Each structure stands twice: as structure tokens, then as C-alpha cells.
Amino acid sequence: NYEIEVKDVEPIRVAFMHYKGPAAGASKVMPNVFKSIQGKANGAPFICYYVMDQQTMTGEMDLCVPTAENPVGNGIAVKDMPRIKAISATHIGPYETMQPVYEAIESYAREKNLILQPPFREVFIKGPGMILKGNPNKYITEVLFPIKE
Ligand SMILES: Oc1ccc(C(=S)NCCC(=S)NCCC(=S)NCCCNC(=S)CCNC(=S)CCNC(=S)c2ccc(O)cc2)cc1
Ligand code: NA
Ligand SMILES: [Zn+2]
Ligand SMILES: [Zn+2]
């Protein structure tokens, strides 16, 4: 049970950097976004996935931290992330266990005659800290997959 529902997700101003490579490796790079705004986030950090492969878990994505601040850091800039009408699925546990969440979103979309519209997002509601890793078994990750409206 991934608590699947359709959400009206409002626009978000983010500090971000572009990242190309394995999604798992993004966690080493995300701290640079927080450091650029002196940790002054006004929302949960997330990845916006533009090009991704489910099997290789590698592609092109933006590492995003919601903020009102002007970032100062190499390769950090600001994007106004657009409003999305999105399928929301919530995953509890480590990031390695998340392919089934996407299968559940695809099934839900197919059954409700909704058309998936990348890019999609993983929102780290409860995840690793900059220093403290915490318990990956209790991580809360919200997948937001936009649909055609
Ligand atoms: O207050 C603070 C302050 C500091 C911090 C810091 S610095 N914390 C530490 C930095 C942070 S925030 N780490 C966060 C966790 C990260 S970045 N994890 C890496 C990514 C995890 N996710 C994976 S490995 C899954 C990747 N997703 C795939 S492979 C899609 C698969 N599905 C696809 S391609 C598909 C499926 C079906 C479709 O129809 C169509 C696409 C935090 C809070
Ligand atoms: Na599939
Ligand atoms: Zn609205
Ligand atoms: Zn592939």
C-alpha cells in the first residue's frame, strides 16, 4: 500500500544543481545545494528526473532544495519548478526497494486512463541528514509523477 492519490502540487522555487550519473550517487552531491543557501530550506529536498533508466538507475536530473534564498555555490542556480497534477505514491524504507512503487504508479495510471508526463520527482520527506545518516528502514520518499490535465 503506497497511499496512491492524485495531488495538485503548487509551483516551488528551488536552489538546484544539474547531476548526470547513478541516482544513488546524487546523495553525495545534494549537500552542495544546502551549503549554497546556508541550509535555509523552506521545503523537503527532491530530485527532478528528466532522463532515467529503471534498470541502470542512471540518467540526468536536478538536485533541488526549496528555498527563498539566493544560492552562492559553483553550478548552483534557481529554477521555478512548475505546478504539476501528479500521481503521489509514498514509499517507506531504503531507496534500493523503490522499483515496485513505479510499477504501482504505472498500473494506477493505466487503470484510471491517466497519461504519465515526465519529468517525475522523488521527495525526501524523511531521509539522510548532511552528517547523520539515520535509519534507512524508516525513510519516507514521496514519488510525484505528473499526468496530462
Ligand atoms: O535539513 C537537511 C539538511 C541537509 C540534508 C542533507 S545534505 N541530506 C543528505 C543529502 C540528501 S537530501 N539525500 C537524499 C537522498 C538521495 S539524494 N538519494 C539518492 C536518490 C535515491 N533514490 C533512488 S537511488 C531511486 C532512483 N530512482 C529511479 S532509478 C527511478 C526508477 N523509475 C523509473 S526510471 C521509471 C519507472 C516507471 C516509469 O513509468 C518511468 C520511469 C538533509 C536535510
Ligand atoms: Na514496468
Ligand atoms: Zn492548486
Ligand atoms: Zn533500460
PDB file of C-alpha atoms and ligand atoms in Angstrom:
ATOM      1  CA  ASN A   1       0.000   0.000   0.000  1.00  0.00           C
ATOM      2  CA  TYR A   2       1.728   3.210  -1.310  1.00  0.00           C
ATOM      3  CA  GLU A   3      -1.196   5.564  -0.326  1.00  0.00           C
ATOM      4  CA  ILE A   4      -1.581   6.400  -4.082  1.00  0.00           C
ATOM      5  CA  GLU A   5      -3.636   9.574  -4.845  1.00  0.00           C
ATOM      6  CA  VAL A   6      -3.647  12.487  -7.378  1.00  0.00           C
ATOM      7  CA  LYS A   7      -2.266  15.769  -5.918  1.00  0.00           C
ATOM      8  CA  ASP A   8      -2.387  19.425  -7.077  1.00  0.00           C
ATOM      9  CA  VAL A   9       1.335  20.214  -6.384  1.00  0.00           C
ATOM     10  CA  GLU A  10       1.894  24.024  -6.410  1.00  0.00           C
ATOM     11  CA  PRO A  11       4.972  25.689  -8.008  1.00  0.00           C
ATOM     12  CA  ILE A  12       8.214  25.507  -5.905  1.00  0.00           C
ATOM     13  CA  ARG A  13      11.186  27.937  -6.083  1.00  0.00           C
ATOM     14  CA  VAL A  14      14.342  25.736  -5.678  1.00  0.00           C
ATOM     15  CA  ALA A  15      18.107  26.079  -5.456  1.00  0.00           C
ATOM     16  CA  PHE A  16      19.424  23.234  -7.681  1.00  0.00           C
ATOM     17  CA  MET A  17      22.405  21.711  -9.472  1.00  0.00           C
ATOM     18  CA  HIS A  18      22.301  19.524 -12.612  1.00  0.00           C
ATOM     19  CA  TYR A  19      23.574  15.933 -11.989  1.00  0.00           C
ATOM     20  CA  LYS A  20      24.368  13.228 -14.616  1.00  0.00           C
ATOM     21  CA  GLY A  21      25.131   9.685 -13.321  1.00  0.00           C
ATOM     22  CA  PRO A  22      23.706   6.981 -10.994  1.00  0.00           C
ATOM     23  CA  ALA A  23      20.750   8.268  -8.856  1.00  0.00           C
ATOM     24  CA  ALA A  24      22.349   6.594  -5.742  1.00  0.00           C
ATOM     25  CA  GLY A  25      25.407   8.921  -6.190  1.00  0.00           C
ATOM     26  CA  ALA A  26      23.187  12.093  -6.047  1.00  0.00           C
ATOM     27  CA  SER A  27      23.139  11.889  -2.175  1.00  0.00           C
ATOM     28  CA  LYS A  28      26.926  12.783  -2.106  1.00  0.00           C
ATOM     29  CA  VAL A  29      26.244  15.900  -4.323  1.00  0.00           C
ATOM     30  CA  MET A  30      22.919  17.190  -2.757  1.00  0.00           C
ATOM     31  CA  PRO A  31      24.790  18.666   0.305  1.00  0.00           C
ATOM     32  CA  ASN A  32      26.377  21.293  -2.074  1.00  0.00           C
ATOM     33  CA  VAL A  33      22.827  22.720  -2.696  1.00  0.00           C
ATOM     34  CA  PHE A  34      22.083  23.026   1.107  1.00  0.00           C
ATOM     35  CA  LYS A  35      25.577  24.594   1.706  1.00  0.00           C
ATOM     36  CA  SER A  36      24.923  27.212  -1.091  1.00  0.00           C
ATOM     37  CA  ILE A  37      21.833  28.571   0.852  1.00  0.00           C
ATOM     38  CA  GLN A  38      23.353  28.090   4.394  1.00  0.00           C
ATOM     39  CA  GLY A  39      20.776  25.255   4.924  1.00  0.00           C
ATOM     40  CA  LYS A  40      17.823  27.754   4.748  1.00  0.00           C
ATOM     41  CA  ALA A  41      15.337  25.367   3.022  1.00  0.00           C
ATOM     42  CA  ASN A  42      11.528  26.066   3.163  1.00  0.00           C
ATOM     43  CA  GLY A  43      10.544  22.548   1.924  1.00  0.00           C
ATOM     44  CA  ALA A  44      11.706  18.890   1.606  1.00  0.00           C
ATOM     45  CA  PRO A  45      14.616  18.328  -0.847  1.00  0.00           C
ATOM     46  CA  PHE A  46      13.813  16.326  -4.034  1.00  0.00           C
ATOM     47  CA  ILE A  47      15.293  15.049  -7.334  1.00  0.00           C
ATOM     48  CA  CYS A  48      13.566  16.018 -10.620  1.00  0.00           C
ATOM     49  CA  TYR A  49      14.351  13.126 -13.058  1.00  0.00           C
ATOM     50  CA  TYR A  50      14.462  14.319 -16.738  1.00  0.00           C
ATOM     51  CA  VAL A  51      16.150  11.222 -18.329  1.00  0.00           C
ATOM     52  CA  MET A  52      16.280   7.952 -16.292  1.00  0.00           C
ATOM     53  CA  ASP A  53      16.671   4.181 -16.902  1.00  0.00           C
ATOM     54  CA  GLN A  54      14.853   1.894 -14.363  1.00  0.00           C
ATOM     55  CA  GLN A  55      17.464  -0.936 -14.851  1.00  0.00           C
ATOM     56  CA  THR A  56      20.743   1.140 -14.712  1.00  0.00           C
ATOM     57  CA  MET A  57      19.195   3.709 -12.247  1.00  0.00           C
ATOM     58  CA  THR A  58      21.408   6.267 -14.137  1.00  0.00           C
ATOM     59  CA  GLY A  59      20.452   9.459 -16.061  1.00  0.00           C
ATOM     60  CA  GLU A  60      20.116  13.289 -15.953  1.00  0.00           C
ATOM     61  CA  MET A  61      18.334  15.040 -13.054  1.00  0.00           C
ATOM     62  CA  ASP A  62      18.219  18.258 -10.948  1.00  0.00           C
ATOM     63  CA  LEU A  63      19.061  18.043  -7.197  1.00  0.00           C
ATOM     64  CA  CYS A  64      16.533  20.548  -5.725  1.00  0.00           C
ATOM     65  CA  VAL A  65      16.112  22.263  -2.303  1.00  0.00           C
ATOM     66  CA  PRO A  66      13.033  24.524  -1.881  1.00  0.00           C
ATOM     67  CA  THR A  67      14.285  27.985  -0.706  1.00  0.00           C
ATOM     68  CA  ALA A  68      13.590  31.783  -0.698  1.00  0.00           C
ATOM     69  CA  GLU A  69      17.422  32.338  -0.542  1.00  0.00           C
ATOM     70  CA  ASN A  70      19.818  33.276  -3.414  1.00  0.00           C
ATOM     71  CA  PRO A  71      22.350  30.387  -3.620  1.00  0.00           C
ATOM     72  CA  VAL A  72      26.144  31.116  -3.629  1.00  0.00           C
ATOM     73  CA  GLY A  73      27.956  27.966  -4.914  1.00  0.00           C
ATOM     74  CA  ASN A  74      29.658  26.522  -8.055  1.00  0.00           C
ATOM     75  CA  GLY A  75      26.999  25.244 -10.534  1.00  0.00           C
ATOM     76  CA  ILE A  76      24.078  26.118  -8.137  1.00  0.00           C
ATOM     77  CA  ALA A  77      21.252  28.262  -9.659  1.00  0.00           C
ATOM     78  CA  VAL A  78      17.461  28.855  -9.140  1.00  0.00           C
ATOM     79  CA  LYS A  79      14.550  27.181 -11.013  1.00  0.00           C
ATOM     80  CA  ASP A  80      10.811  27.952 -10.601  1.00  0.00           C
ATOM     81  CA  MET A  81       9.572  24.308 -10.676  1.00  0.00           C
ATOM     82  CA  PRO A  82       6.118  24.318 -12.336  1.00  0.00           C
ATOM     83  CA  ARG A  83       2.756  23.276 -10.808  1.00  0.00           C
ATOM     84  CA  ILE A  84       2.104  19.541 -11.550  1.00  0.00           C
ATOM     85  CA  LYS A  85      -1.110  17.499 -11.315  1.00  0.00           C
ATOM     86  CA  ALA A  86       0.665  14.322 -10.142  1.00  0.00           C
ATOM     87  CA  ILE A  87       0.134  10.716  -9.006  1.00  0.00           C
ATOM     88  CA  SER A  88       1.573  10.697  -5.423  1.00  0.00           C
ATOM     89  CA  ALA A  89       2.953   7.359  -4.062  1.00  0.00           C
ATOM     90  CA  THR A  90       4.639   7.212  -0.587  1.00  0.00           C
ATOM     91  CA  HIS A  91       7.466   4.634  -0.047  1.00  0.00           C
ATOM     92  CA  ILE A  92       8.717   3.678   3.489  1.00  0.00           C
ATOM     93  CA  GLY A  93      12.236   2.099   3.556  1.00  0.00           C
ATOM     94  CA  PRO A  94      15.594   2.258   1.693  1.00  0.00           C
ATOM     95  CA  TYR A  95      15.986   3.712  -1.879  1.00  0.00           C
ATOM     96  CA  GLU A  96      17.004   0.212  -3.223  1.00  0.00           C
ATOM     97  CA  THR A  97      13.354  -1.033  -2.677  1.00  0.00           C
ATOM     98  CA  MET A  98      11.577   1.533  -4.953  1.00  0.00           C
ATOM     99  CA  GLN A  99      11.056  -0.154  -8.384  1.00  0.00           C
ATOM    100  CA  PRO A 100       7.692  -1.622  -7.160  1.00  0.00           C
ATOM    101  CA  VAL A 101       6.428   1.959  -6.313  1.00  0.00           C
ATOM    102  CA  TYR A 102       6.833   2.895 -10.047  1.00  0.00           C
ATOM    103  CA  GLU A 103       5.077  -0.364 -11.148  1.00  0.00           C
ATOM    104  CA  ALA A 104       2.149   0.613  -8.807  1.00  0.00           C
ATOM    105  CA  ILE A 105       2.049   4.182 -10.322  1.00  0.00           C
ATOM    106  CA  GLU A 106       2.077   2.730 -13.928  1.00  0.00           C
ATOM    107  CA  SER A 107      -0.782   0.271 -13.027  1.00  0.00           C
ATOM    108  CA  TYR A 108      -2.821   3.085 -11.333  1.00  0.00           C
ATOM    109  CA  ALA A 109      -2.308   5.389 -14.398  1.00  0.00           C
ATOM    110  CA  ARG A 110      -3.250   2.558 -16.893  1.00  0.00           C
ATOM    111  CA  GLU A 111      -6.421   1.633 -14.868  1.00  0.00           C
ATOM    112  CA  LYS A 112      -7.627   5.275 -14.469  1.00  0.00           C
ATOM    113  CA  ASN A 113      -6.784   6.163 -18.131  1.00  0.00           C
ATOM    114  CA  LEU A 114      -4.192   8.760 -16.953  1.00  0.00           C
ATOM    115  CA  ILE A 115      -1.169   9.569 -19.225  1.00  0.00           C
ATOM    116  CA  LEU A 116       2.220   9.822 -17.399  1.00  0.00           C
ATOM    117  CA  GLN A 117       4.130  13.073 -18.264  1.00  0.00           C
ATOM    118  CA  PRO A 118       7.829  13.101 -17.221  1.00  0.00           C
ATOM    119  CA  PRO A 119       9.752  14.591 -15.613  1.00  0.00           C
ATOM    120  CA  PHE A 120       8.954  12.829 -12.257  1.00  0.00           C
ATOM    121  CA  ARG A 121      10.190  13.615  -8.703  1.00  0.00           C
ATOM    122  CA  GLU A 122      11.358  11.770  -5.559  1.00  0.00           C
ATOM    123  CA  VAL A 123      10.698  13.990  -2.458  1.00  0.00           C
ATOM    124  CA  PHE A 124      12.836  13.078   0.619  1.00  0.00           C
ATOM    125  CA  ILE A 125      10.165  13.695   3.351  1.00  0.00           C
ATOM    126  CA  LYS A 126      12.391  11.740   5.830  1.00  0.00           C
ATOM    127  CA  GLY A 127      15.892  10.838   4.505  1.00  0.00           C
ATOM    128  CA  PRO A 128      19.632  11.075   5.351  1.00  0.00           C
ATOM    129  CA  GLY A 129      20.980  14.276   7.012  1.00  0.00           C
ATOM    130  CA  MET A 130      24.193  16.070   5.868  1.00  0.00           C
ATOM    131  CA  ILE A 131      26.087  14.339   8.778  1.00  0.00           C
ATOM    132  CA  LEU A 132      23.617  11.863  10.437  1.00  0.00           C
ATOM    133  CA  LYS A 133      22.601   9.002   8.039  1.00  0.00           C
ATOM    134  CA  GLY A 134      19.624   7.973  10.276  1.00  0.00           C
ATOM    135  CA  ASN A 135      17.692   4.662   9.826  1.00  0.00           C
ATOM    136  CA  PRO A 136      17.138   3.955   6.066  1.00  0.00           C
ATOM    137  CA  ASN A 137      14.337   1.437   7.027  1.00  0.00           C
ATOM    138  CA  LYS A 138      12.221   4.463   8.246  1.00  0.00           C
ATOM    139  CA  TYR A 139      12.982   6.789   5.228  1.00  0.00           C
ATOM    140  CA  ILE A 140       9.773   8.385   3.748  1.00  0.00           C
ATOM    141  CA  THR A 141      10.033   9.065  -0.050  1.00  0.00           C
ATOM    142  CA  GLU A 142       7.069  10.591  -1.986  1.00  0.00           C
ATOM    143  CA  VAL A 143       7.151   9.853  -5.769  1.00  0.00           C
ATOM    144  CA  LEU A 144       5.341  12.606  -7.776  1.00  0.00           C
ATOM    145  CA  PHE A 145       4.594  11.521 -11.394  1.00  0.00           C
ATOM    146  CA  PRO A 146       2.826  14.289 -13.384  1.00  0.00           C
ATOM    147  CA  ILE A 147      -0.233  13.308 -15.501  1.00  0.00           C
ATOM    148  CA  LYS A 148      -1.844  15.085 -18.525  1.00  0.00           C
ATOM    149  CA  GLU A 149      -4.658  17.532 -17.476  1.00  0.00           C
TER     150      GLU A 149
HETATM  151  O1  LIG B   1      17.676  19.665   6.537  1.00  0.00           O
HETATM  152  C1  LIG B   1      18.538  18.904   5.809  1.00  0.00           C
HETATM  153  C2  LIG B   1      19.844  19.348   5.619  1.00  0.00           C
HETATM  154  C3  LIG B   1      20.748  18.590   4.878  1.00  0.00           C
HETATM  155  C4  LIG B   1      20.359  17.370   4.315  1.00  0.00           C
HETATM  156  C5  LIG B   1      21.256  16.598   3.560  1.00  0.00           C
HETATM  157  S1  LIG B   1      22.616  17.394   2.811  1.00  0.00           S
HETATM  158  N1  LIG B   1      20.994  15.290   3.446  1.00  0.00           N
HETATM  159  C6  LIG B   1      21.813  14.363   2.650  1.00  0.00           C
HETATM  160  C7  LIG B   1      21.528  14.571   1.149  1.00  0.00           C
HETATM  161  C8  LIG B   1      20.096  14.158   0.773  1.00  0.00           C
HETATM  162  S2  LIG B   1      18.798  15.334   0.989  1.00  0.00           S
HETATM  163  N2  LIG B   1      19.932  12.938   0.259  1.00  0.00           N
HETATM  164  C9  LIG B   1      18.595  12.495  -0.148  1.00  0.00           C
HETATM  165  C10 LIG B   1      18.643  11.050  -0.629  1.00  0.00           C
HETATM  166  C11 LIG B   1      19.166  10.899  -2.065  1.00  0.00           C
HETATM  167  S3  LIG B   1      19.645  12.338  -2.975  1.00  0.00           S
HETATM  168  N3  LIG B   1      19.224   9.639  -2.513  1.00  0.00           N
HETATM  169  C12 LIG B   1      19.659   9.279  -3.870  1.00  0.00           C
HETATM  170  C13 LIG B   1      18.415   9.015  -4.727  1.00  0.00           C
HETATM  171  C14 LIG B   1      17.523   7.989  -4.023  1.00  0.00           C
HETATM  172  N4  LIG B   1      16.609   7.366  -4.994  1.00  0.00           N
HETATM  173  C15 LIG B   1      16.964   6.319  -5.748  1.00  0.00           C
HETATM  174  S4  LIG B   1      18.524   5.529  -5.766  1.00  0.00           S
HETATM  175  C16 LIG B   1      15.912   5.784  -6.715  1.00  0.00           C
HETATM  176  C17 LIG B   1      16.222   6.358  -8.090  1.00  0.00           C
HETATM  177  N5  LIG B   1      15.012   6.412  -8.925  1.00  0.00           N
HETATM  178  C18 LIG B   1      14.880   5.677 -10.031  1.00  0.00           C
HETATM  179  S5  LIG B   1      16.053   4.524 -10.617  1.00  0.00           S
HETATM  180  C19 LIG B   1      13.588   5.859 -10.840  1.00  0.00           C
HETATM  181  C20 LIG B   1      13.088   4.495 -11.312  1.00  0.00           C
HETATM  182  N6  LIG B   1      11.857   4.603 -12.107  1.00  0.00           N
HETATM  183  C21 LIG B   1      11.844   4.979 -13.397  1.00  0.00           C
HETATM  184  S6  LIG B   1      13.252   5.459 -14.339  1.00  0.00           S
HETATM  185  C22 LIG B   1      10.608   4.947 -14.053  1.00  0.00           C
HETATM  186  C23 LIG B   1       9.719   3.905 -13.766  1.00  0.00           C
HETATM  187  C24 LIG B   1       8.481   3.828 -14.400  1.00  0.00           C
HETATM  188  C25 LIG B   1       8.121   4.789 -15.339  1.00  0.00           C
HETATM  189  O2  LIG B   1       6.913   4.708 -15.956  1.00  0.00           O
HETATM  190  C26 LIG B   1       9.004   5.827 -15.641  1.00  0.00           C
HETATM  191  C27 LIG B   1      10.243   5.904 -15.002  1.00  0.00           C
HETATM  192  C28 LIG B   1      19.040  16.934   4.507  1.00  0.00           C
HETATM  193  C29 LIG B   1      18.135  17.692   5.249  1.00  0.00           C
HETATM  194 NA    NA B   2       7.075  -1.595 -15.585  1.00  0.00          NA
HETATM  195 ZN    ZN B   3      -3.574  24.440  -6.966  1.00  0.00          ZN
HETATM  196 ZN    ZN B   4      16.814   0.231 -19.641  1.00  0.00          ZN
END
